[PDB]
Amino acid sequence: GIVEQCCTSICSLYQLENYCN
Amino acid sequence: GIVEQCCTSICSLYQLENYCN
Amino acid sequence: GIVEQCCTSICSLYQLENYCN
Amino acid sequence: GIVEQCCTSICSLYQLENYCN
Amino acid sequence: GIVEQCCTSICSLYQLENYCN
Amino acid sequence: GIVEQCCTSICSLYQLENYCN
Amino acid sequence: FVNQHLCGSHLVEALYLVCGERGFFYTPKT
Amino acid sequence: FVNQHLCGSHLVEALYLVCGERGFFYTPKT
Amino acid sequence: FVNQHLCGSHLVEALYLVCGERGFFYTPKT
Amino acid sequence: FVNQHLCGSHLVEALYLVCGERGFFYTPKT
Amino acid sequence: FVNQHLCGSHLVEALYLVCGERGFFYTPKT
Amino acid sequence: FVNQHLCGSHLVEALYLVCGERGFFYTPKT
Ligand SMILES: [Cl-]
Ligand SMILES: [Cl-]
Ligand SMILES: [Zn+2]
Ligand SMILES: [Zn+2]
């Protein structure tokens, strides 16, 4: 999920938008 | 400038990106 | 809502806890 | 002290109140 | 006090240093 | 540079002023 | 605990501390 | 933009930046 | 609520949240 | 992405997220 | 160093940076 | 004052504190 994608691995600002409502 | 604009009005991430090295 | 309440007035940690998953 | 309890180990919000005045 | 001064007017890092242990 | 001086190693507030404009 | 006055990102910081591993939803008005 | 490690409160600060008024969910259990 | 690791500036942000107007002390040497 | 209302240190946080390893310059008016 | 305008949690962040391992006390008025 | 490890967003928050109106540059590539 988000922790794996963005903390453990590395993510872009675009990928962060995946978790917007 | 950008510092004042973001605070007194609004600004976008795209405008912010102009200040990257 | 909670976002507006905490900013325009005040809110408690107990009210915040309602927004946990 | 607080660093051992809350950083090195893990503490609750209730335990944090131990360091309020 | 310092908390109110830094917020309603301005304060220096040197004034802040007085609150260190 | 700054990351080496202040993150990897350890720096003072005075050394941080090295990166002011 | 004390009552809170929280705007902007500070609300999100509080939710983070309150909810921990449970996570949370941030849902502002329009 | 860039790709970096974003964890904990820094991750939710980034969600707040990116999502803002849309709102977001932070669900670390997944 | 929950239990998490709180360190450095994150620890003092949490003290501020929890204590607020009461005030607090942060004394890492102990 | 959404438009931003950013004052003080919050602008610097946004620049940090936006620029990543590129770094950035913070240049307020007078 | 420059003069500071610091409210809320931002004061606590500044105290944290200024005092380091010495720690500090946060004591707002009533 | 003191000497501590300052990294990432914490480093730029410290630059903002120390430099303020002067402005600053954060150039991690060097
Ligand atoms: Cl961290
Ligand atoms: Cl603020
Ligand atoms: Zn703030
Ligand atoms: Zn951090």
From Swiss-Prot, chains A, B, C, D, E, F:
Disulphides: 6-11
Protein name: Insulin A chain
Organism classification: Eukaryota, Metazoa, Chordata, Craniata, Vertebrata
Gene name of this polypeptide: INS
Covered residues, full protein: 90 to 110 of 110
